[PDB]
């Protein structure tokens, strides 16, 4: 639980940016009928800017499951066995019993210093099917930083 800064600079954290705009959107209905690997990919944007996404879910003490929320840079496609290595990307876990809310911030990334071109894609995967003992909804809050 906390705030994840993907591809962070080691020197910059030795002992600035901020979110300018805001947005909200529902992604999918988290239900037990979706097994592992139920990907939901959202390209960003839906100016040399870094993104800041706060994916949240509505879960109670009787809800169980796990979502993997990551930001893949230039996700053209995902192969059959590639999902298992998604943790290679700036990612977080949403668990109803641990944090039930994700927050990832990534810098500008590209071949050039100015972008047009979906550089980043927010990917949400259902790592484990939803378990209960009454529906769970996922809402994504996306805000550009340092435009």
């Amino acid at each position: 639980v906390g705030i994840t800064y993907g591809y962070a600079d080691a020197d910059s954290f030795r002992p600035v940016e901020q979110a300018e705009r805001f947005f909200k959107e529902k992604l999918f209905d988290w239900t037990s009928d979706k097994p592992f690997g139920t990907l939901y990919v959202l390209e960003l944007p839906k100016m040399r800017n870094g993104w800041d996404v706060q994916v949240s879910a509505t879960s109670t003490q009787f809800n169980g499951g796990s979502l993997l929320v990551a930001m893949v840079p230039e996700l053209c496609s995902l192969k059959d066995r590639e999902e298992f290595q998604l943790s290679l990307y700036p990612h977080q876990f949403i668990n109803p019993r641990t944090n039930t809310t994700a927050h990832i911030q990534v810098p500008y990334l590209g071949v050039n210093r100015h972008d047009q071109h979906q550089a980043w894609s927010l990917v949400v995967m259902v790592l484990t099917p939803l378990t209960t003992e009454g529906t769970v909804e996922v809402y994504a809050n996306i805000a550009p930083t340092n435009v």
Binding site: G64, S66, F84, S87, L88, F93, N95, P96, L109, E133
Partner: protein
């Protein structure tokens, strides 16, 4: 005024891994800089240590608790060629290296309801009985899902040789690499839960002899 030399036989052929450099065409090029770029990695295994990747338990990364009395949720080898490790980044990285040595870290995450608390023990069985009492004399560790739903189980390197072979053929051999297994000590199971298992390279793991597999 002429240096006498002798062109030896045997040297001079085109080697694809020779240390010698070539003669540049545009020798006065100066690319600006790449210092402030993000995500640079200069070592492959450094990526594998900090990026645990999930295991393949019959197409799924999690393990379902069983109501029947067996006390063994899973029993998988520690071989990179095993179907369990098939999807991991380490196995993908191990396919291109002949030999390896070092330790593995296995990460376990519990994704059940917050009300249900379960206690699990992880046992390593060096090259085999499948009971906690016989695993007491062997390497073992126990973690309760009431303090941290995240457990790391370092697997020591106990192979006979200094280095092991990345490529081999052992489906369920008793002496494969140590038979990591997960035991649930609580027989008072309430309902179905899940345990996500992922593996990351240990701080001392080391691959060697890069190989192009043409199998």
């Amino acid at each position: 005024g002429i240096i006498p030399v002798a062109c030896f036989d045997g040297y001079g052929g085109f080697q694809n891994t020779d240390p010698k450099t070539a003669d540049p065409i545009y020798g006065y090029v100066y690319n600006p800089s790449r210092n402030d770029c993000h995500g640079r990695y200069s070592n492959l295994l450094d990526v594998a240590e900090a990026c645990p990747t999930f295991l393949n338990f019959d197409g799924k990364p999690y393990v379902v608790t069983k109501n029947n009395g067996d006390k063994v949720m899973t029993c998988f080898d520690v071989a990179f060629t095993h179907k369990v490790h098939k999807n991991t980044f380490l196995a993908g990285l191990a396919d291109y290296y002949a030999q390896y040595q070092g330790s593995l870290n296995y990460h376990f995450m519990y994704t059940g309801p917050t009300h249900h608390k379960a206690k699990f023990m992880v046992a390593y069985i060096p090259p085999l009985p499948k009971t906690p009492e016989d695993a007491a004399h062997c390497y073992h560790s126990e973690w309760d899902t009431g303090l941290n739903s995240q457990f790391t189980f370092a697997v020591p390197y106990v192979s006979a040789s200094d280095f092991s072979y990345t490529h081999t053929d052992t489906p369920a051999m008793a002496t494969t690499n140590g038979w990591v297994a997960v035991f649930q000590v609580t027989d008072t199971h309430s309902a179905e839960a899940a345990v996500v298992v992922s593996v990351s390279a240990g701080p001392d793991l080391e691959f060697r002899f890069p190989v192009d597999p043409v199998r």
